Amino acid sequence: YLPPVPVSKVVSTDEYVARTNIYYHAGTSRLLAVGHPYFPIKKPNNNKILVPKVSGLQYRVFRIHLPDPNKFGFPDTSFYNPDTQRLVWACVGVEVGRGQPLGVGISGHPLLNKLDDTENASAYAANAGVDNRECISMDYKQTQLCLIGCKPPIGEHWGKGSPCTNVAVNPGDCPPLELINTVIQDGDMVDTGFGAMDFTTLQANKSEVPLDICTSICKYPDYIKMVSEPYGDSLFFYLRREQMFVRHLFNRAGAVGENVPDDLYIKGSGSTANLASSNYFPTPSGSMVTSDAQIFNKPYWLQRAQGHNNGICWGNQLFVTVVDTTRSTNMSLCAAISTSETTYKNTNFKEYLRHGEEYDLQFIFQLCKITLTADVMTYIHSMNSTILEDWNFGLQPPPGGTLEDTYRFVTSQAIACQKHTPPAPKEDPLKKYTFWEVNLKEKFSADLDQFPLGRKFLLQAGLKAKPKFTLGKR
Amino acid sequence: DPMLTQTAASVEVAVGGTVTIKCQASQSIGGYLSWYQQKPGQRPKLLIYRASTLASGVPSRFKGSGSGTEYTLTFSGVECADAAAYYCQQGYTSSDINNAFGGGTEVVVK
């Protein structure tokens, strides 16, 4: 019956969420990942993945499922009416940690398109061998970041789109190269070296960069798209860090289409009436990776987001992405087919390559209740439909029925086909985009004195009567 | 195997006529194509490469066009020393081909 007017501007969360003194700690156990650093190996006949690609250049987005605090247990003096107000979690402290030695992570594939070097010479030879490309290896560039948001982060790349139908003269033409931005998966790589172009739907020779980024897309986060949205979602504490350097100077194959103008050089004679190259790819190199500036195992907290919402986690969810390439060791492994021969050989020992990574996450969550009297109800539904739809405020349909018969023996010839054959949503829409699930349904702890981060948060704020004087001195 | 056939014997032309020699290719070769004049007593001699760029010491009265699979070579103002043999030739430098880039002749001009 005639609801009041809704405010045309958005607002911070200080006005409509409450803050109590009830804190909880949630830390996952240990997370390990082993595989090959270059390509996911597969059978020669068909697709099946024996080892996963694991190298220290991926994105490693995490997905934290939180317990629903509308049926959750508390100590005394925490009360609410479930017909009037509901509850939601808010993070105040977060840590990302790794225990490893400190590595480098070089790469290079045996068919790299190099012609010559253009740093010194004595006489340039126009050579043009059929595929004269040669193995050259290189270093990369070190980067770090941490992004914490309620929804996944957003990166970008430079790709290819359809041009205007004006002129079509040759299959050897140039694309338009428009800019698009997508959602970030778990396995997309970053290089702040060659940069954000997918080397598959843009480069057909696929011999431009090393092979760890040759069948995939090298993305890069935005930092403009994720701050210009009017809510303050998807990131609220970012810490950027990287270093770079240039090492060597080379040449591509040289089949130039964008020709040089005439009125730029002077024509000579003899061997001096040609072109050497115009296309130059340089190599990157991360240098001096010293472990005093590493933005890790340091428990930073939150008092202010850069956006409008604080660490309120709608939908009982949370996302963490960390990027590291400082622990990029490589493990030269080898094993021998026969040990009895008392002389070493060519082919008696055959070798492999592996890469590993170890993570650990710890959080500090804070309780937040939200009262709802007819005004924020209009606001929350307009923020996102699923936030109001995860709580039932409508009464029952006319047939409710006994929810699902639940047959006992699910695989037989007696019953018909069962178990979720027509899948009506209710699921996450982001099911088609993979992540790393971290199940924290019953990881929580009400006390936090005997926890490795819990005293570090407790020492920072006031600890007066909170610890308690269990059995005394005299 | 990219093949240029050139099954075309040249027609009798007078002084100042225009001749359209057409060289068609089965596979797409890009723009990499050459042309030559062969006087029947001496070494062969080239006019144009990449179907648009002419060589040194050659007048600009020879023309070059064509892209993709079919190409041409036209000129006008036929002199007395244009009685020679002509040949179109690709540059796809493949291995399993047996090209010989053959075909082409030119009558004695009246």
XYZ file of C-alpha atoms in Angstrom:
584
model
C 0.000 0.000 0.000
C 1.913 2.968 -1.439
C 5.571 2.472 -0.395
C 7.649 5.604 0.272
C 10.061 7.100 -2.220
C 13.478 5.429 -2.554
C 16.579 7.579 -2.364
C 18.058 8.226 -5.797
C 21.657 8.010 -4.601
C 23.588 5.077 -3.174
C 24.903 5.060 0.385
C 27.681 3.561 2.500
C 27.055 0.641 4.827
C 27.501 2.644 8.039
C 23.826 3.594 8.060
C 22.063 0.235 7.795
C 24.241 -2.572 9.210
C 24.972 -3.023 12.904
C 28.172 -4.043 14.672
C 28.404 -6.217 17.790
C 31.296 -7.422 19.952
C 31.107 -11.068 18.820
C 34.149 -12.126 16.796
C 35.063 -15.429 15.177
C 38.194 -16.933 13.656
C 38.297 -19.143 10.567
C 41.515 -20.526 9.145
C 41.926 -23.207 6.507
C 44.383 -26.005 7.079
C 47.006 -26.235 4.292
C 46.723 -26.215 0.508
C 49.175 -27.987 -1.806
C 49.363 -28.219 -5.606
C 51.743 -30.364 -7.682
C 52.012 -30.696 -11.446
C 53.974 -29.670 -14.520
C 54.974 -26.022 -15.114
C 54.493 -25.843 -18.882
C 51.580 -27.859 -20.270
C 48.944 -30.183 -18.784
C 50.039 -33.590 -20.000
C 47.536 -35.806 -21.760
C 47.233 -39.140 -23.482
C 48.208 -39.347 -27.176
C 44.846 -40.899 -28.084
C 42.350 -38.513 -26.480
C 41.690 -35.965 -23.756
C 42.479 -37.028 -20.179
C 44.563 -35.026 -17.736
C 47.217 -36.923 -15.800
C 48.976 -33.941 -14.212
C 47.582 -30.390 -13.999
C 49.414 -27.264 -15.057
C 50.641 -25.734 -11.827
C 53.289 -23.083 -12.601
C 53.812 -20.006 -10.493
C 52.230 -17.532 -12.907
C 48.528 -18.363 -12.465
C 45.845 -16.432 -10.583
C 44.677 -18.835 -7.835
C 41.292 -17.295 -7.118
C 39.692 -18.633 -3.959
C 36.027 -19.044 -3.109
C 35.113 -19.028 0.564
C 31.772 -20.586 1.453
C 30.690 -19.191 4.742
C 28.243 -20.762 7.213
C 24.773 -19.262 7.200
C 24.357 -17.207 10.390
C 20.558 -17.461 10.421
C 20.747 -20.853 12.171
C 24.163 -20.491 13.853
C 25.111 -20.840 17.515
C 26.286 -18.006 19.749
C 27.102 -17.329 23.395
C 24.722 -15.366 25.612
C 23.196 -11.879 25.128
C 22.895 -12.229 21.322
C 19.229 -12.132 20.369
C 17.065 -11.152 17.417
C 13.587 -11.772 16.071
C 13.795 -13.709 12.771
C 10.620 -12.016 11.501
C 12.174 -8.538 11.797
C 15.971 -8.653 11.429
C 18.492 -11.062 9.899
C 22.253 -11.598 10.196
C 25.309 -11.309 7.947
C 29.088 -11.748 8.231
C 31.746 -9.054 7.878
C 35.501 -9.546 7.622
C 37.896 -7.328 9.573
C 41.228 -9.110 9.156
C 42.781 -11.292 6.470
C 46.130 -13.000 5.874
C 47.677 -14.835 2.938
C 50.673 -17.036 3.577
C 53.167 -19.303 1.875
C 55.954 -21.528 3.121
C 58.516 -22.205 0.398
C 62.018 -21.310 -0.682
C 62.481 -18.389 -3.043
C 62.760 -19.075 -6.761
C 62.954 -17.684 -10.280
C 60.848 -19.588 -12.861
C 62.422 -19.219 -16.296
C 60.968 -20.698 -19.483
C 61.391 -20.905 -23.247
C 60.159 -23.168 -26.016
C 62.337 -24.831 -28.697
C 60.690 -23.113 -31.691
C 61.005 -19.409 -30.878
C 60.851 -17.034 -33.856
C 64.205 -15.239 -33.692
C 66.290 -14.110 -36.667
C 69.251 -12.166 -35.254
C 70.264 -9.682 -32.566
C 70.313 -5.917 -33.021
C 72.726 -4.853 -30.274
C 76.006 -5.355 -32.135
C 76.873 -6.542 -35.644
C 79.506 -6.347 -38.382
C 77.547 -7.246 -41.550
C 73.860 -8.139 -41.755
C 72.928 -11.206 -43.802
C 69.537 -11.495 -45.507
C 68.940 -15.113 -44.705
C 65.238 -16.092 -44.650
C 65.573 -19.770 -43.762
C 62.340 -21.685 -44.188
C 61.638 -22.085 -40.535
C 65.023 -20.910 -39.261
C 63.648 -20.266 -35.745
C 65.765 -21.312 -32.768
C 65.416 -22.104 -29.068
C 65.973 -19.039 -26.883
C 65.005 -18.906 -23.209
C 64.243 -15.922 -21.037
C 63.146 -14.617 -17.658
C 59.876 -13.029 -16.568
C 58.712 -10.118 -14.433
C 57.776 -10.360 -10.778
C 54.284 -9.243 -9.690
C 52.210 -9.436 -6.508
C 48.613 -8.543 -5.708
C 45.787 -9.288 -3.291
C 42.131 -8.486 -3.999
C 39.236 -9.144 -1.605
C 35.685 -8.767 -2.891
C 32.200 -10.175 -2.497
C 32.128 -11.106 -6.208
C 35.010 -12.274 -8.444
C 37.519 -9.788 -9.861
C 37.620 -8.514 -13.430
C 40.567 -8.485 -15.832
C 41.141 -7.475 -19.441
C 43.030 -8.277 -22.632
C 43.395 -7.004 -26.191
C 41.926 -9.332 -28.788
C 40.159 -9.349 -32.145
C 36.697 -8.410 -33.382
C 34.794 -8.059 -36.614
C 35.767 -5.019 -38.719
C 33.439 -2.916 -40.812
C 32.561 -4.321 -44.222
C 34.282 -1.583 -46.208
C 37.425 -3.173 -47.673
C 38.567 -6.805 -47.921
C 41.682 -7.207 -50.060
C 43.745 -10.016 -48.524
C 43.757 -12.726 -45.867
C 47.098 -11.197 -44.847
C 45.454 -8.118 -43.339
C 45.364 -6.573 -39.852
C 42.659 -7.022 -37.173
C 40.847 -4.098 -35.469
C 42.151 -4.912 -31.924
C 39.328 -3.723 -29.699
C 39.460 -3.930 -25.907
C 37.244 -6.291 -23.904
C 37.114 -7.238 -20.231
C 36.066 -10.599 -18.777
C 35.722 -12.368 -15.438
C 38.864 -14.029 -14.078
C 39.166 -17.821 -13.795
C 41.649 -20.037 -11.930
C 44.397 -20.772 -14.408
C 44.630 -17.650 -16.504
C 48.144 -16.248 -16.454
C 49.651 -12.785 -16.134
C 52.682 -11.274 -17.745
C 53.475 -7.597 -17.411
C 56.152 -8.314 -20.050
C 54.747 -9.023 -23.517
C 51.319 -8.021 -22.238
C 47.655 -8.805 -22.579
C 46.986 -10.323 -25.988
C 45.622 -13.837 -26.358
C 48.260 -15.521 -28.484
C 45.814 -18.068 -29.968
C 42.978 -16.115 -31.602
C 45.445 -13.400 -32.625
C 48.729 -15.113 -33.581
C 48.561 -18.081 -35.943
C 52.253 -19.019 -35.975
C 52.038 -19.534 -32.148
C 55.814 -19.103 -31.853
C 56.081 -15.578 -30.426
C 56.524 -16.030 -26.660
C 57.417 -19.172 -24.627
C 55.008 -22.067 -24.449
C 53.609 -21.535 -20.952
C 51.517 -18.758 -22.449
C 50.814 -20.056 -25.936
C 47.504 -21.967 -25.773
C 45.822 -19.613 -23.298
C 45.102 -15.951 -22.555
C 47.426 -13.678 -20.564
C 45.068 -11.404 -18.644
C 45.631 -8.299 -16.482
C 43.371 -6.675 -13.855
C 41.711 -3.333 -14.440
C 41.759 -1.144 -11.266
C 39.403 1.278 -13.050
C 36.380 -0.935 -13.735
C 36.423 -2.217 -10.170
C 36.433 1.230 -8.560
C 34.059 3.084 -10.912
C 31.065 0.839 -10.247
C 28.656 2.643 -7.901
C 28.644 0.110 -5.043
C 32.202 -0.479 -3.903
C 31.951 -4.207 -4.570
C 34.473 -6.749 -5.945
C 37.535 -5.186 -4.300
C 37.992 -3.266 -1.102
C 41.665 -3.781 -0.162
C 44.250 -3.991 -2.951
C 48.051 -4.048 -2.634
C 49.952 -3.841 -5.911
C 53.655 -4.613 -6.347
C 55.962 -5.448 -9.277
C 59.425 -4.906 -10.770
C 60.860 -4.982 -14.289
C 64.013 -4.662 -16.413
C 65.055 -5.063 -20.067
C 67.813 -7.481 -21.057
C 68.231 -8.200 -24.788
C 67.047 -7.023 -28.197
C 66.080 -9.319 -31.073
C 64.151 -9.638 -34.343
C 61.121 -11.498 -35.680
C 60.945 -13.403 -38.985
C 60.511 -10.233 -41.030
C 57.577 -10.708 -43.449
C 56.669 -7.046 -43.185
C 53.275 -5.876 -44.376
C 53.261 -2.375 -42.949
C 56.114 -1.245 -45.150
C 58.577 1.511 -44.291
C 57.984 4.873 -46.003
C 60.407 5.956 -48.682
C 61.250 9.400 -47.274
C 62.823 8.154 -44.044
C 66.201 6.741 -45.096
C 68.699 7.262 -47.905
C 69.250 4.587 -50.534
C 72.771 3.263 -50.908
C 74.048 0.651 -53.353
C 75.199 -2.946 -53.508
C 74.233 -4.865 -50.376
C 72.736 -1.676 -48.888
C 69.482 -1.668 -50.876
C 67.322 -3.824 -48.625
C 65.786 -3.874 -45.156
C 67.166 -5.643 -42.099
C 64.071 -5.735 -39.868
C 61.576 -3.369 -38.352
C 60.053 -5.564 -35.638
C 61.866 -5.941 -32.339
C 60.828 -8.047 -29.412
C 62.763 -7.485 -26.181
C 63.040 -9.901 -23.369
C 61.949 -9.292 -19.769
C 63.885 -10.136 -16.621
C 62.836 -9.857 -12.993
C 65.852 -8.836 -10.952
C 66.943 -8.911 -7.300
C 63.858 -10.489 -5.784
C 65.055 -9.794 -2.170
C 62.841 -11.023 0.661
C 62.295 -7.851 2.613
C 59.666 -6.260 0.346
C 57.503 -9.376 0.050
C 53.848 -8.482 0.710
C 52.950 -11.714 2.471
C 52.518 -13.290 5.954
C 51.662 -9.878 7.419
C 48.229 -9.664 9.078
C 46.732 -6.406 7.829
C 43.256 -5.340 8.976
C 40.434 -3.132 7.696
C 38.882 0.066 8.992
C 37.884 1.652 5.673
C 37.135 0.387 2.194
C 37.955 2.372 -0.909
C 34.360 1.829 -2.024
C 31.001 2.372 -0.418
C 30.487 -1.012 1.210
C 32.881 -2.313 3.844
C 33.741 -5.991 4.218
C 30.065 -6.960 4.459
C 29.862 -10.302 2.683
C 26.473 -10.695 1.043
C 25.403 -14.208 0.156
C 27.772 -15.688 2.796
C 30.625 -15.677 0.306
C 34.094 -14.209 -0.182
C 36.764 -14.165 -2.891
C 40.559 -14.033 -2.506
C 43.067 -13.836 -5.337
C 46.845 -13.754 -4.878
C 49.456 -13.634 -7.622
C 53.028 -14.593 -6.899
C 56.020 -15.474 -8.991
C 58.755 -15.125 -6.373
C 58.475 -18.738 -5.160
C 59.026 -19.923 -8.739
C 61.481 -22.709 -8.183
C 61.792 -25.510 -10.696
C 62.520 -29.088 -9.655
C 64.890 -30.875 -12.007
C 63.848 -34.481 -11.393
C 65.323 -37.546 -13.083
C 65.141 -41.322 -12.708
C 67.108 -44.205 -14.185
C 65.815 -47.121 -16.267
C 68.677 -49.392 -15.107
C 71.190 -49.066 -12.283
C 73.507 -52.053 -12.816
C 75.699 -50.350 -15.428
C 78.835 -48.996 -13.737
C 79.278 -46.355 -16.452
C 76.865 -43.459 -16.899
C 75.242 -43.078 -20.306
C 73.137 -41.046 -22.724
C 69.816 -42.702 -22.148
C 69.735 -44.621 -18.927
C 68.283 -41.791 -16.870
C 65.292 -39.887 -18.222
C 64.196 -36.663 -16.590
C 61.014 -34.783 -15.685
C 59.980 -31.362 -14.378
C 57.609 -30.509 -11.527
C 56.424 -27.438 -9.634
C 54.782 -27.016 -6.245
C 53.056 -24.374 -4.146
C 51.788 -24.175 -0.550
C 49.099 -21.818 0.766
C 47.420 -21.023 4.073
C 44.561 -18.607 4.758
C 43.304 -17.166 8.039
C 40.438 -14.735 8.568
C 38.750 -12.796 11.353
C 35.012 -12.357 10.892
C 32.645 -10.048 12.759
C 28.906 -10.451 13.252
C 26.512 -7.953 11.684
C 22.739 -7.817 12.097
C 20.475 -5.805 9.796
C 17.068 -4.570 10.858
C 14.468 -4.254 8.100
C 11.489 -1.878 8.360
C 9.993 -1.305 4.902
C 12.700 1.113 3.684
C 15.891 -0.930 3.412
C 13.672 -3.716 2.027
C 13.183 -1.668 -1.131
C 16.898 -0.867 -1.161
C 18.303 -4.389 -0.716
C 16.136 -5.955 -3.447
C 17.290 -3.235 -5.812
C 20.931 -3.844 -4.916
C 20.783 -7.494 -5.931
C 17.785 -9.784 -6.274
C 19.532 -12.853 -4.846
C 20.314 -11.162 -1.514
C 16.625 -10.870 -0.738
C 15.908 -14.201 -2.408
C 18.265 -16.158 -0.140
C 15.891 -15.378 2.748
C 12.214 -16.294 2.531
C 9.837 -13.409 3.276
C 6.897 -14.858 1.336
C 4.495 -17.435 2.734
C 3.762 -20.815 1.289
C 2.492 -21.834 -2.170
C -0.905 -23.598 -2.160
C 0.627 -27.027 -2.884
C 3.684 -27.469 -0.715
C 3.611 -31.258 -0.570
C 6.183 -33.469 1.097
C 9.375 -32.090 -0.466
C 10.893 -34.856 -2.758
C 10.050 -38.573 -2.348
C 13.721 -39.499 -2.009
C 13.801 -43.111 -3.251
C 16.291 -45.247 -1.345
C 18.087 -47.415 -3.926
C 18.910 -44.788 -6.517
C 20.531 -47.085 -9.134
C 18.232 -49.942 -10.104
C 15.908 -51.105 -12.835
C 12.838 -50.697 -10.625
C 12.602 -46.909 -10.440
C 12.642 -44.429 -13.300
C 15.457 -41.963 -13.967
C 15.845 -39.580 -11.053
C 18.113 -37.058 -9.321
C 18.182 -33.605 -10.919
C 17.735 -34.447 -14.584
C 16.076 -31.057 -15.386
C 18.367 -28.549 -13.563
C 16.308 -25.424 -12.671
C 18.911 -22.740 -11.545
C 18.866 -22.128 -7.713
C 22.567 -22.896 -8.289
C 25.300 -20.340 -8.672
C 25.197 -18.688 -12.120
C 29.016 -18.802 -12.089
C 29.024 -22.621 -12.263
C 30.247 -22.382 -15.866
C 33.353 -20.500 -14.621
C 35.655 -22.583 -12.452
C 37.268 -21.503 -9.177
C 39.015 -23.073 -6.190
C 36.413 -24.097 -3.633
C 37.360 -23.795 0.040
C 34.778 -25.382 2.321
C 34.564 -23.597 5.688
C 31.159 -24.749 6.902
C 32.287 -25.820 10.385
C 35.772 -24.321 10.658
C 34.678 -21.432 12.911
C 35.735 -20.972 16.533
C 34.194 -18.730 19.176
C 37.369 -18.376 21.219
C 40.506 -17.153 19.500
C 43.193 -17.124 22.205
C 44.747 -20.424 21.074
C 44.956 -19.505 17.418
C 48.028 -18.295 15.497
C 46.432 -15.135 14.130
C 43.975 -14.736 16.993
C 46.441 -13.284 19.456
C 47.848 -10.968 16.772
C 44.442 -9.364 16.316
C 43.847 -9.441 20.074
C 47.167 -7.742 20.855
C 46.424 -4.965 18.363
C 43.088 -3.906 19.837
C 42.177 -3.776 23.510
C 42.704 -6.953 25.530
C 41.300 -5.957 28.933
C 39.228 -8.639 30.695
C 38.667 -10.389 27.299
C 41.361 -13.115 27.906
C 40.131 -13.964 31.515
C 42.270 -14.791 34.592
C 42.227 -18.598 34.521
C 44.094 -20.200 37.426
C 46.009 -17.537 39.273
C 49.491 -16.862 40.569
C 48.803 -16.970 44.307
C 51.232 -28.265 -55.109
C 50.609 -24.712 -56.370
C 50.453 -24.857 -60.165
C 50.447 -22.048 -62.712
C 49.363 -23.455 -66.053
C 49.705 -20.692 -68.698
C 47.993 -22.529 -71.561
C 47.792 -19.454 -73.779
C 49.649 -18.917 -77.058
C 49.981 -15.225 -77.796
C 47.959 -13.366 -80.420
C 49.497 -11.355 -83.297
C 49.764 -7.693 -82.245
C 50.755 -4.553 -84.119
C 52.779 -1.541 -83.000
C 50.989 0.117 -80.094
C 48.648 -2.733 -79.166
C 47.806 -3.996 -75.687
C 48.309 -7.616 -74.603
C 46.710 -9.299 -71.569
C 48.761 -12.306 -70.452
C 46.933 -14.104 -67.642
C 48.627 -16.511 -65.218
C 46.290 -18.425 -62.895
C 47.289 -20.432 -59.824
C 45.563 -23.335 -58.088
C 46.653 -22.623 -54.517
C 46.788 -19.172 -52.953
C 50.364 -17.865 -53.076
C 49.896 -14.367 -51.727
C 51.562 -11.650 -53.744
C 54.845 -13.516 -54.285
C 55.113 -13.754 -58.071
C 57.721 -12.899 -60.708
C 57.810 -12.291 -64.463
C 60.582 -12.677 -67.022
C 61.361 -11.922 -70.648
C 63.416 -14.482 -72.572
C 64.984 -13.375 -75.794
C 65.696 -16.594 -77.724
C 69.450 -16.061 -78.042
C 70.599 -14.956 -74.593
C 70.006 -15.254 -70.833
C 66.577 -14.525 -69.316
C 65.809 -11.112 -67.913
C 63.330 -9.983 -65.273
C 60.801 -7.145 -65.324
C 58.569 -7.136 -62.238
C 58.355 -8.951 -58.896
C 55.589 -9.155 -56.264
C 53.145 -8.203 -59.084
C 53.571 -4.449 -58.458
C 57.258 -3.465 -58.062
C 59.338 -3.085 -61.221
C 63.098 -3.575 -61.443
C 65.846 -1.091 -62.309
C 66.602 -0.069 -65.886
C 63.121 -0.982 -67.139
C 60.653 1.613 -68.491
C 57.451 2.314 -66.591
C 55.268 1.410 -69.591
C 54.894 -2.162 -68.310
C 52.026 -2.711 -65.886
C 51.385 -5.065 -62.990
C 48.182 -6.124 -61.237
C 46.294 -9.149 -59.928
C 45.905 -10.544 -56.430
C 45.007 -13.848 -54.798
C 45.036 -16.730 -57.295
C 45.032 -15.027 -60.713
C 47.424 -12.364 -62.003
C 48.081 -10.401 -65.183
C 50.768 -8.479 -67.059
C 49.804 -5.764 -69.556
C 51.739 -3.173 -71.539
C 51.274 -0.924 -74.558
C 53.478 0.584 -77.239
C 55.189 -2.562 -78.510
C 58.654 -1.893 -79.928
C 60.717 -4.031 -82.307
C 62.806 -5.711 -79.570
C 59.800 -7.122 -77.693
C 59.955 -10.396 -79.653
C 60.841 -12.691 -76.758
C 59.444 -15.387 -74.458
C 57.503 -14.649 -71.270
C 57.143 -16.658 -68.051
C 55.157 -16.206 -64.840
C 56.726 -17.645 -61.697
C 55.649 -18.085 -58.064
C 57.748 -18.043 -54.899
C 56.009 -20.392 -52.457
C 59.355 -22.370 -52.105
C 57.582 -25.595 -51.118
C 59.169 -29.060 -51.101
C 56.859 -31.586 -52.783
C 56.194 -29.468 -55.889
C 57.472 -29.874 -59.462
C 56.680 -26.370 -60.711
C 58.995 -25.414 -63.626
C 56.779 -22.214 -63.753
C 56.200 -22.784 -67.445
C 54.113 -21.355 -70.261
C 54.191 -18.208 -72.338
C 55.300 -16.991 -75.758
C 55.180 -13.864 -77.892
C 54.882 -13.534 -81.685
C 57.126 -11.451 -83.921
C 55.484 -8.020 -83.980
C 54.532 -6.655 -87.398
